[PDB]
Each structure stands twice: as C-alpha cells, then as structure tokens.
C-alpha cells in the first residue's frame, strides 16, 4: 500500500542520502533525495551537532528513537558512536519517562502488546508479528520499572530500549529481537484516572489468570520460534520474578537480567577487588545493606564462587550476613524471614546490633554491599569503621538512583583516605584528594553482562541457562581488567569499551557452554573467537547496487 | 518493509484509532497497545505534548514528525490550531529548519531536480510513486522570504506551502508535488557547509538554467496533463517576473509572490475604500519601494480602477512609488525599467508625502521604520482617514507599528501590516497573509479543469476576500477576516473563482454545477478516518 | 504475498523472455529465465507454432486464456495477429462450452461475481476489485448465452471473452476493463444436479430481489468509478435485456450489444446492399422470418435511416412486413400481436400466405432477413422466387447457432445465379461457382460496431447512448466499403482489418457526438482522428530499464 521504493521506505534496508548515485539511478530513487551523496560518517556527525542543540533527556529521547523507525543502520551507528553517554538516554533512567510525558504515536510496530483481555488467543497475537526468526525475547508486565514502580504499559519502552543495547553492545540481529509488553492492568492509581493512558483501565489479576496468560505467552513463542528463544524477564514484581525464573528455567532458555545479571556483575566487581586483597576467601565477611532481591541474587552466585575456591556451601553461606530495615537476620527474630533468605539468617552472636554501624564494629566484614534503595546510610561512621577494621575496606553502594545510594564516591574515598575499593550503581565522576591522588571509580552496570551472555547462548542454539553460565561471565568481564585499570582504582573495564567486553564475555561463554554441553550448534567450532566475530551484526551499510555486467556475447541465432 | 500495508502507510494507518474488530481481522491485534482510542483523542494527546514544547523549530520538527506516520492526524492537528501553526509549518519557522537541522530521510518530501539530471528530468518526474498530480509547488531556493538564498535548504518551503493548500482549502495531499530545482547556491556558508544537502557549484546562469526550467515544465505537464497546476515560489526577482511572462499563457501557472501579494493587498485597500468611501478619482497612491511587491500590488490596483470606470493612463497616473534612489521621476540618476515606468511621471520619503499629497502610502521597502512619526502626522494631516500599509516582514522590517499607526493618528488611520500584532477605543489591526488567497484560488482552477490563470483572477479573489468581511469588522478598522476561519474563507473564496472561470469560458469541467458552492464543498478533502472494517455478513441457507 | 520481483510476476508488466539483459540484471531477475533474450515477434512466433498442434478449439481456447494470465501484451498480440480466426475461440460460440467441459481453478481474479446472495452488500463487492478506473464492464447473468442457453455461472467466460476484443480491436485498456457476472441461480436443471457446478444451487429468481441486485450493482459501480462509466449488457434473457434498456439508458451510460449493435451492423450490410441497388429507398420491401427481438431491433433501426432519407415514420414502417411461426403479421389475424408488433402489422393483401415461399410471391420484397432462430426456411423454393422477383435479391440468413441459419451461403449464390446479396450470422467459407466466379459471402458479426462504438464514447466522456449513435456507427462501417469491394458484392469490410475499421468508426462516432453535444472531454480536438489514434493502447512492450547516466565532475 505505502506507495514508493520499498528500499528506502524500509528502515532495515534505508540508507537516505548515503545511497549511492548508481544505486539512486538504478532503484528508481533519482529525484526521490537531495542532490548530495553522502557516507554514513556525515550523516552521524550532523545527528550528533544537533542532539547537542536539544535541552531535556526526553527530547533526546524522542530524537534519537526516531532515527531507529527511519535508518535502523544509522540508528545503531549513532548509539555505538556515543554509547556510554546515550545508554542512560535509550534505557534506564529515562526510557520510564518517556511514555508517562508523551506517549506515542504509531506507524510501525514497537513490539507485541498481549493483555489479559487476550487469553485463550496469544498465539494469534505472536503470528501477526512480521518477523519470522526471532531469536531474543525481552518480556514485562511493567509492574516494577525501575525507579519509578508500576506504570503499566507506559513501560514497553524498558524492553525497546533492553533490545537496542542487546544489537549495539553485542551485535544481537535487530530483525531477531523481540520487545513485549504484558498488559494485565495496572494498580497506579493516576494511569487509572488519565484519558490518555494506553492500556486497560482495570487493577493488575493476581488471580490464576495471570500464571495462565505467562504461560500461554511462553507456549506460544516457543511454539512459533522454537524451544531455544532466548526469553529475558525483565521489571517484574519481586515475587513474579524468581517464581517465574523458578518455574521456567529448566523448561525454556530464560533469564531474570535484574536478578541474574545484577549477580553477575557484582560478582565481577568483588573478584576485581580481590586482585588488590588477595588474602584467602576463608578470611573474607560479607555484610548486606538490606535483603531483597538484588541481596539475595548477588549472595548465591558469591557462595557459588566460594564453593568453586574450596568452601562447602554451607561454610560459604556463613560468610555472609545481611541486614534490612527490620535489622540484622538472625534465627528467631520478630521481622518476617522468606525461605530465599533463610541460608544467610544466621544465629545471633553475643552481642545484637541496633544499627549498621553496629553490625560492621561486631561482625567486622572485609565488604559492604548496599542494594536497600534508602538513602545514604553508609554513614561517615560506618565508612570510618570500616577503615578501621580493614586496611582496603571493599564498599559497594549499588542503589540507584544517585539520590537513593548509600554514599558518594567522594565520601568513600575521602573518608577512608584512598584506601576503600568502592564501586557503585550510579555514575560518579573522578575523586581528587588534597594529597594529588586522583581515584576513578567504576559503575556494576548490568549492561557489562547481558549482551555477551545473550550472544553466547543464542550463538550456541543453548537451551537452559543455569546459574553457572553467570558465575563464568563475571570471571570473564574481570579478566578484562588491565593492571593501569586497576592501579587507578576501577573494578571494571571502561564503559567506552563495551562493545569489545561484551564480545571478549560472548566468546568465553561460548568456550563454556560448549565445555559444559550445554551447547546443541554442531559442528562445533575450533576457534571460538572466530565464530562469535564472524557472527555479530555490523551497522556498516551494505551496498544494494544491483550486478550489471557484459555477456560475452560471441553463434547468431538462426 | 515486513508488517501490514494498511499500518504503515500514513495514508490509511489509524494508529490506536483501529477499532478492535479492525485490528483482529486486518491482522493488527497485539501490534498497537490495549486501547481504542478516536481522532479526537489522539489530537488532544498531540496539543498536550505541543504545549509543553517551546522553541518553534522543536515544535516544527514535532508535527512534521507525524505527516510521516498518520496523515489524517497531521492533518486535523493543522486544521485544530491553524493561525498559531501556520507560522511554525510555514514562513518564517520552516526556512529555519532545513539550515539549522538538515533532515534524516526515509520517505521522499518530494522532487529534487538538479542542472547535473538535465536531460533526465522526465525520469526523476517518473520516479515520483503519485499518479494523480494537481498542485506543484517549485522553488530554486534563490529567494526564501527573510532568508534569502539557501539553496536546497529551501525544499522546506514548497513542503509547507502544500500543506497549507491541504489544510486551508481540502486539496488531496496525495495529488500534491514540492519541487526543489537545485543549479547551485551562491551562499558562501552553505558552498563550505560539510553538512549542506545539494551541488556544491556557484548558481547555473547560463542558457542551461532556462534549459532545465523548460524541462521541468514539459516533463511535469507530459505525465499529469496540460491543466496540472504549477506554481512558482522564491525565485530571485528577474527570474520570478520573466518566467510567469514566458509561462503563463501556456501552462497553468501563477506566482504567489507576485500575484497572491498583489491580490491580499488589495483586498485590504479594498476593505479601507467601503468604510472611506473616497471617489475613486480622488485616490493617489504612493509607494515606498518599486520592486517585485510594488509593481505586483500597483498593476492589480490599475486593473481594479480600470473595471470601474478609469482609463489605464488615468488609473496609473494616480500611482507614484520612491526607491532607495528617491523619487522615480521621468530622467532621473537612477535606473528606470519598462515595468516601472508605466508607474514613472523631493529628497526624503517624508517631502514626497507632503508635496504629492497621497491618500495612501504602501510599505513594501524592507529597510526598517521608513515611515517615522513624522511620516505619520503628515498623512493624518493631508487626510482625514489616512491609508497606510506597512507591509515589510519581518515584524522588525515593518515601515511602522499598529501602536505607532493609531496613536499618531488619533486613531483615524485605516493601518494593515505583513506582520503579526495585538489589538490596540480599540483598534484590532488586519494582516495581509498572502495564505488568504493561494488555497482557494488553487482549489477552484484545479476543480474547474483551468488551463490559464489571467490577472483577473486575482482580482476576483481580492473582491471575495473583502466581502467575507462583516460591518462589525469594519467598524473595528479590521481589513481581513480573522486568519481563525481561514478554511471557511478559503472555500468562500473558491466558490466566487469557481463561478468566474465558468462565466468567461476559463473552465473545462463538464458537465458544469448548476450549484457551485455544493461542487466545491462537496470536493473538498476529509481529514475524518473512514471505516477499515471488512464486510461480514451471512449468506442465505449441495448434490 | 508471492515471493519474486513484482514486474515479473504481474502479467500487466511482466515480458518473460523479452525482458533485455540489461533490465534482467538491473531489477533482480538475472537467472531466474533462460539465458536468452527474445523479441515480441519470436515469442508470437512460437505461440503460433504451438497452437497447430492444438486440435479442437476447447484445447486452443484454453492455452491462448492461460497466456492472458501470464503475459497480457503477448496475449494481446497474438489475438491481434490472428484476429479473424481467433475472435471465434475467444468469444461466441467456443468461449460458453469452457467452463462446462472443464471449469476452472483460480489464481487471479477474472472478473467480479455479484451473486443474490451479496443483495445488500454490493458496494464492498465492487470495493474489492484491484483497478481504480475502470472504463468498460460487460456483465451478464448467464440466462442467454447466445446458442446456448441458461449456462448460470458458467457464462463468466462471456464478458471475459467480450472485453478481450474492446481491448484487441479498438485498443481500449485492458485496466480499465471489468467483466461482472451476476449469480441469481440457474434453471438448468444439469447444472443444478452438478457437484462441479460453481454457482448457487437455486432456480433463477425472479422476485423483487433480481430487480432490486441489478439497480445495487448499476448504482455500486458508478458510485466508485463514474457516472460516465460505460456498462454493457449481454446475454440477459430477450425480455429482461430489453426492459432494462429502457430503464437504464437515461440514467446510466449503458447499450445493449444483443440489441443495438445487432440492429447496427445488419443496417450497415443493408446500406451497402442499396449502393449496388441504386433503387430509390421508397421502392424497397423488405420481409422479415420471424417477428421477435432482432426482427424488431433490426426494423426499428432501418426505420431511422430511412426516416432520416426523407420518409415519414409511417410511410417507413410500411415498407417492413414480418412472418412468425403462425404466419403473417397482418391486421385482424387469430394469433396475438403485441403492441411492439403493432407497427409493422398492416391491412391484409389480396391473398394471405400460408408459407415463406407464399409470401415472397404475393409480397416480392426487394429484401428478406431470417431471425426466426428455426432452421432452414429459406427453402431453395424461397431462394427461387426471390431471384426471379429481383435481378439482385437481398437475403440475410442471421439466425444462430450455424444449424439454425436460414439457408448457407453455398445455397443463396448457386440458386439465385450469382445474382443475390448475401450475408448471415454464421462462418461461411467463399463460394465458387462453376463458370469460376469466387463469391466471398458478408458476415454481420456485432464485432465490426461494439469496440468503435465503445472507444468513442468513453475518450468523449459521453454519459447516455442514444440510437443515433448506431445508426451513424452502420453509416460509418458501410462508408469503409471500397469501390472493388462494392463491385464484388462484399456488404462489409474484411475481418482481418477490424483494428482499422474500429478506429475508423470511433473517429466517425467521436465526431459525431462532439457535433450533437453528447461529448463532455474538453477542450474538444481540432483533429478527432489524432485525438483517437493517439489514445488507442498499444500491445508493444515498453522498456522498463533504469535511466542510468553520469553526473559532471566537496568541503571536508
Ligand atoms: N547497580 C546495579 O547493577 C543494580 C542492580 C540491581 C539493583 N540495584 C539497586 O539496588 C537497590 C535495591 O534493589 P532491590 O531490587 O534489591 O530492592 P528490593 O526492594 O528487592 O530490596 C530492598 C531491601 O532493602 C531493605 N531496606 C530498605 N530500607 C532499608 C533501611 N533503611 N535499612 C536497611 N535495609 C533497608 C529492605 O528491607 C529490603 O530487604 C535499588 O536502589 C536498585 O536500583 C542496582
Ligand atoms: N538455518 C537457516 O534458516 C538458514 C537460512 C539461510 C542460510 N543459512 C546458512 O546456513 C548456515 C548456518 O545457519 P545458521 O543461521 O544456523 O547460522 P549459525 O549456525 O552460524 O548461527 C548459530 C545460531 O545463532 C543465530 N545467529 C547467528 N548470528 C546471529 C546474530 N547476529 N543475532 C542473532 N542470532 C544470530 C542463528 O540463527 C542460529 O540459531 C550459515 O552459513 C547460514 O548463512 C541458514
Ligand atoms: N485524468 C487523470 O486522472 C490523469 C492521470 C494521470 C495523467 N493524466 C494525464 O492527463 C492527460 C490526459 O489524460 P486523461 O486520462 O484525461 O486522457 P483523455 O482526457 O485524453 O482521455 C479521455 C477519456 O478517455 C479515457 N481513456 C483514454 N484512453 C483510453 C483507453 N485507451 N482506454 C480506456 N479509456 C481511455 C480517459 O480515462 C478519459 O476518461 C495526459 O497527458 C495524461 O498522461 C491524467
Ligand atoms: N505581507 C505580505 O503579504 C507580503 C508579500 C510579499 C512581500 N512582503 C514584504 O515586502 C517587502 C519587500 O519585498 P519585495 O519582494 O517587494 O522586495 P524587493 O527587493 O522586490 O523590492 C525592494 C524595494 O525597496 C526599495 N528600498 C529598499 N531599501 C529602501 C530604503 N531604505 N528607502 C527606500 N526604498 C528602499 C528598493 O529600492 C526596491 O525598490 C519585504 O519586507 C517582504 O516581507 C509582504
Ligand atoms: N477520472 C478518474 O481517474 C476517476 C477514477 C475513479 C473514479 N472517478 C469518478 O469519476 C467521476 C469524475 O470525477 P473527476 O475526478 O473526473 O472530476 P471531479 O468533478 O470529481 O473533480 C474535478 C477535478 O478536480 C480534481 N479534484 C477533485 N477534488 C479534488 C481535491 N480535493 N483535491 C485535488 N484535486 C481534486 C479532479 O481530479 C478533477 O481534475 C467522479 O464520480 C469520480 O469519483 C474518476
Ligand atoms: N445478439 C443476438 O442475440 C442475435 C443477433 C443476431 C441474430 N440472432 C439470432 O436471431 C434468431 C432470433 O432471435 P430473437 O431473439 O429475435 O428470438 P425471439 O424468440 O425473440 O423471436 C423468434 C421469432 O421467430 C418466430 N418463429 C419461430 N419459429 C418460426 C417458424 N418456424 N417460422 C416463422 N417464424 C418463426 C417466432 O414466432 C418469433 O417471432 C436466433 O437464432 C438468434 O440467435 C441473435
Ligand atoms: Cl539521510
Ligand atoms: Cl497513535
Ligand atoms: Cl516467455
Ligand atoms: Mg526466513
Ligand atoms: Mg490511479
């Protein structure tokens, strides 16, 4: 119907003004663009000269995306240019925004939207998308964007913006990707009162009706696209989102990246802190700022590292202790302990903590790892403490956003005079002390982890993710660590860098998964290296000069 | 490009307007969000995320946005707030944003015909995918209005001119062309602009420019046909008058620079004669400029004097006009053409007033407050209801103000501006929007089959405009209808065309109306969606 | 959506092996057709070839329709090429036996079914054909397929067949063609016991709802395309064909091929008989075998152009006489006469025949025109006695099918001595007679008005038919007719240069209608043969290569 050229009518073949003059001449495009022939390179730099030009994230925003409906080519060419700057643009924190602000106006399909209105007819839904190869699922229900909570189908933009880093950091194919979006209703209750707002008009089901509808969402993208779709949940209640990894892992090629991939990276940033205090894991205690998700995420996939370093898991389980706004977990407190929790409530020493502080000066932990989400409460004297108590005290301030971290960079370094190893979720800038030294410190961002171990698994046609997978990729994101990195105080590689890293991560995986047969692409590759780079998407434009050449043409016909 | 034809054509798609049953049996269930939504809301959504936007060029860039993904939608929000965006989709936002952003294609804004395709221009035309053509629009880009040359920066320009045909008087978008004709710039900016859009050479002024101009004409006229509307749009002055001399008598082509400028300008001084009721014969017009606006605007004031009963010679006897060089006197310094000197028969502008003693002085310089307080006290002087049109744009270009013009009066001055401004006893001051007179004028040649535009035309549309006018209005020196009704203006206006090209054998539309507001009504373009729905239904109730 | 490049795959532009080297590589279908590149004229060649080996005329019909569908210039060229033995495969009489022998199995759509079923529902009938200008629908209901009878659904070959030659003859659009059948059931009473039959299983209605779905359809498709939108009826049952001409024909831009161009172009072989006749129009007599729709038609017409030559209406009508099956149509008689009758019902003669033969000799008309649609009448008694009343007798045998005609040609020429005017409605071969003289014998086939007449009023934008136009539609056939032609006793032009002689009519028709004010396409031409010439379509392939060429010979 959408009468013209269909090369430059589809954003997937779109080149605009980087089509050539032949190929203008030959595809019946002549007249159709300027009369300037451009490369890619031009067409960057006057995208980025006039991102400059635009004041707010959202208007960023809103530019940027567009491009992603016109030239998909240029869209991923821009975003890999200037990733570490336009990450924080295309998904968190701004992409929970957009929607909320200004909505949308459709032409081209964002992704699927099932509701709970549609149950009994999902598959039909799946069969109206027109790609016919996916090979990654990002999937929400929007119940816990995070940052902000339940927005409803105002959060189908988190699984868009998960999928354009899945494309720009590891080379994932943007025509393979699939973002989802599962309406079940919303309890917010001014989405409920707005005209405007795009979903149902009714409370979330919490009924049976809401496992039903997961479950044929499940069913019917593995029906159409195969058992070994990668199916990637993300911002999910906290409930919704370990029994749905519980419930799906050994049965579909699935992962939860807020509790999974969080692990991971953690992980990375303490065994990059261990390069520095490399006394025996023996030795090492683990003290948590709260007890919740990303806690326990990151507390079982540190016992499965332990475990691998010559402690039994119940040894390793002791190691680590966790405080939450109730206090610290000990057997037999009044505040409520889940069945997740419970390895790491431990029987009360001699002495009961009131307060963090107190829980550092009588467990004495060598790290401190905050994911409460409640403000500074690594206070001056808890950093202090811990100065005290270790000569290189490990300080991990995960919580996001900036306001909501335990504490700054400057108040780690500053007060533990330069010799903490602190890492955090939000982005800190260098820290100068009075004395010269100058501290770089580096952000556990998930995006170091998803991207790799989404390739290698896709690559490796890998059917089930188990927990080691990302025990593997935190070891590999690590090794990537120069000692000049490390000498200037990072525990991780830069963010400049995160399409190599997440390469480097897909191929090591990919090295395991095959050791470990978890694998079913066969025949097997020698060279690892070699197979992942020859397989990762490029954002260089191909040319679509149709072949024009000489017949020899030398007997007549009679 | 994979989905459904009907959702990714702006021509047909709905957006979250597909009804449900829509969405479930053309194949879009689960491709658009749980909601039905109407026009209606979508609009709102789009005012909502408008005014919470500030600079013009975001704003422009916003609702060009959506021409590309929901026309109808486009195309009611245009019609929703017409005067506020008229500016920002058209003159002065739109030369702007090409200079200052560029653009990121997907879908063509129209034809690029460049000296480097002469001899393959009909190729290009054949390359456009519309098959029914009606309204062209072309620029060179040589003359934007306030910008001057910005070559091919300057496609903007026939972009938003069509959308004003579409949003002002219902000519179908799909039989609408924007033409860039691209022989070079002479604008040393853009020659060194890594980021400019189009031939990095000096402007073509040799026979090839008049060469490709031809071409161009033929090959647009050998695909859609003798009667195909064509008009021409910022060309440099010489180029602008010699190509609607060369042009007009065969082909359908008018240029609204000359002839809608003429005809709006007009219709003011027209609106200024029913409250003054001066005797025709008493009338002296003087011009400040004698450029492409004067002469345009003073050939249609003679034509005007002449069907009431002047002479041509008497009627141009009573038009003088004062240059940049003084006074155009017979053997004066400065040079005098052939089109100036029908109008050719004091040191300052100041001294013509009071020696000439004019009743009407028209701003058409560009140079800034040529008409000084002095200016004015001296026309409120000689008159007791002095005309004085400051016509210059932009606003800071303007002769004088509205403030200015009553004040200095005593509010007795009949006062019309190119330029925007407040009512100021209040006086609510007219402009004089050449965007009066294009639409309608467009619609009834196209409707009517017309194959030539005469001046006549013009005058008519100027006549049709003034009427519109209520006695309330004019009570309150209002010169023009409020720019609001400017789509019920726009058809009032086709309607009196109408009925003129068919009363002097300039229409080829037959059968001919016995009713001509019903035909051009009943013509117009809808931005309403229609029904997508498939029809259902059961059959009655085999060896 | 069918994979492969659209140019190829749409018959309307696809050239098969014509399509050059060049335009092969530069739209992607290098491969994907033998390495070798022919022209029209081969591929004509090799169709031509083929169709020799082709027996029956069911077989040739069926190969020479699968190429409409696959490469319509072709097509069009080989209809053009062997136009005169081709027009009797793909029309009257092989085109109604098709769809009996073998049905057919569908990809692309022939044409539009409306059945009684859709009453209500037209509009999104007429919505779902693929062309937005349509120009020329033919539609039946399949009630009176010529020789043939109540085929029901299986008449969709009709206007299919019909349409092929408005756009083989006269060059008008294949595009902006639209064959219709309607579906209201069948009385054959074979078909309604046929499990391979593809339409209702109901006898015909017959109610208000037939009526009511024939004003749905007139009322769909000029709602979607034009009031000025050209709508012929063919093979309607006599009454329904005519009722509906009468209602249709001043509201609509409609005509009625069975009736009109019938009426036409026996007018035109009747004019050309009266330039070798040179006797005075209020001399002739003319007596018609039979008294029903084409003997009225065919009457009516002659009583125009003989009013038009200076007799009253009356004085004409009195120079016409009919014989039915129960005898002459004479005043006061037993048998009915209805009101249609009435004018050419006179004062009974002297004696009132009992036979044909009889009534030649009381009567001895200059003419006689069999269109009794009952087999050999024209006894050689009756050829006898019109040559020894005339010294050039007149006789038209137009009765249909072939078995049915009145007399063959081999019998007018050798009775009557060489003597007799002839033509039919059925395909006689030349007839040589002893002392060596070849007589080639006229046939009246509607093909030589119907195109000409269509041309010129759709580029007139003409919005009502009168009979006018026919009758200056026959004046323009005859006028075609060379002074050799004349001597040899030929009543019409050739059918092997029916393009010519098309065009030739909708120049005359073209003139005609801009003269009377029925045309509406202004500016008018100066030259009405140019403005035709110049719009007919064209069956030679187009290039569709790329326009590729180099620029002349940037800041960093
Ligand atoms: N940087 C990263 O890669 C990353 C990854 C995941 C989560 N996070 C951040 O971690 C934080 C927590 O996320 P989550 O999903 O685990 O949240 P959650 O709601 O699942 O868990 C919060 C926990 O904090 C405890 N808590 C709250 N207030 C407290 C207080 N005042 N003192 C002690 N404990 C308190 C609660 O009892 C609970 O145990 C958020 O800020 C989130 O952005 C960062
Ligand atoms: N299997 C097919 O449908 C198909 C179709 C055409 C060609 N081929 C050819 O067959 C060979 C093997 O086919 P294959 O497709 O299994 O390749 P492969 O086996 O090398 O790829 C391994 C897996 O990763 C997927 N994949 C590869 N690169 C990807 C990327 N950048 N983003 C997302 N997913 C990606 C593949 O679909 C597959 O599941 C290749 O030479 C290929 O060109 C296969
Ligand atoms: N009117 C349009 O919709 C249209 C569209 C595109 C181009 N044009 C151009 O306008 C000029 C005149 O075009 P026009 O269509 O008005 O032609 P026209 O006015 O010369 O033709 C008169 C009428 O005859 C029809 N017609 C012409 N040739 C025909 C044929 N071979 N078969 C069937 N119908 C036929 C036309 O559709 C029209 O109704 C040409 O230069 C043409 O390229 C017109
Ligand atoms: N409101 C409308 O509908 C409308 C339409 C067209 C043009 N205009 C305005 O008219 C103005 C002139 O446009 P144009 O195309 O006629 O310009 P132009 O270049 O064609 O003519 C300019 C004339 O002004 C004279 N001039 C310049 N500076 C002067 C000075 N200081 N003193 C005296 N004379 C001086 C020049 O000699 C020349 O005769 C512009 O500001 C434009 O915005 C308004
Ligand atoms: N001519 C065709 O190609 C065509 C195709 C399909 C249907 N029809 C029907 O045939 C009849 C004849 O219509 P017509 O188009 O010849 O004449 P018209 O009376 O409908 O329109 C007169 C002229 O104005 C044009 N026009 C009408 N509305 C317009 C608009 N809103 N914007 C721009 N141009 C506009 C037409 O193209 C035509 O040139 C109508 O009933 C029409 O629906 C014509
Ligand atoms: N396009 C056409 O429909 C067309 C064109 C030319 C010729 N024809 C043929 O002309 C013939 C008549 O068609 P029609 O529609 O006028 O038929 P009809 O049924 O309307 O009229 C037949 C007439 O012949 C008379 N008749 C029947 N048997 C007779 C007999 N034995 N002796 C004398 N008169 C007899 C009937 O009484 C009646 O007057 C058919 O063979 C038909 O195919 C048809
Ligand atoms: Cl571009
Ligand atoms: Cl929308
Ligand atoms: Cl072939
Ligand atoms: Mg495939
Ligand atoms: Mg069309």
Known sequence: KEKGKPLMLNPRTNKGMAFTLQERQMLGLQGLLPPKIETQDIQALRFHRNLKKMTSPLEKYIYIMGIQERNEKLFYRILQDDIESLMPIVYTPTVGLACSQYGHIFRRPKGLFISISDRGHVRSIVDNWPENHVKAVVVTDGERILGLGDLGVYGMGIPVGKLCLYTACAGIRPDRCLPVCIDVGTDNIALLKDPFYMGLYQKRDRTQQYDDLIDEFMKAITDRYGRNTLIQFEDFGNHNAFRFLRKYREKYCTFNDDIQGTAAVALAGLLAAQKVISKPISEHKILFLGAGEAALGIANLIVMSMV??????????????????????????????????????????????????????????????????????????????????????????????????????????????????????????????????????????????????????????????????????????????????????????????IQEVSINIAIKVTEYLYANKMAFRYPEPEDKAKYVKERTWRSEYDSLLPDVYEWPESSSPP
């Open 308 to 497: 691998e370093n010559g402690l039994s898991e119940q040894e390793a389980q002791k190691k680590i202790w966790m405080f939450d706004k109730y206090g610290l977990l000990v057997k037999g407190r009044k505040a409520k302990i889940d069945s997740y929790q419970e390895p790491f409530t431990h029987s009360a020493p001699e002495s009961i903590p009131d307060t963090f502080e107190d829980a550092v000066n009588i467990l004495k932990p060598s790290t401190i790892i905050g994911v409460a989400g409640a403000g500074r409460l690594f206070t001056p004297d808890v950093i202090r403490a811990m100065a005290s108590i270790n000569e290189r005290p490990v300080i991990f301030a995960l919580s996001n956003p900036t306001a909501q971290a335990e504490c700054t960079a400057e108040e780690a370094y500053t007060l533990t005079e330069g010799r903490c190893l602190f890492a955090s979720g939000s982005p800190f800038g260098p820290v100068k002390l009075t004395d010269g030294r100058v501290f770089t410190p580096g952000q556990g961002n998930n995006v170091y982890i998803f991207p790799g171990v989404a390739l290698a698994v896709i690559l490796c046609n890998t059917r089930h993710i188990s927990d080691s997978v990302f025990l593997e990729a935190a070891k590999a994101l690590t090794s990537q660590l120069t000692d000049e990195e490390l000498a200037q105080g990072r525990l991780y590689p830069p963010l400049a860098n």
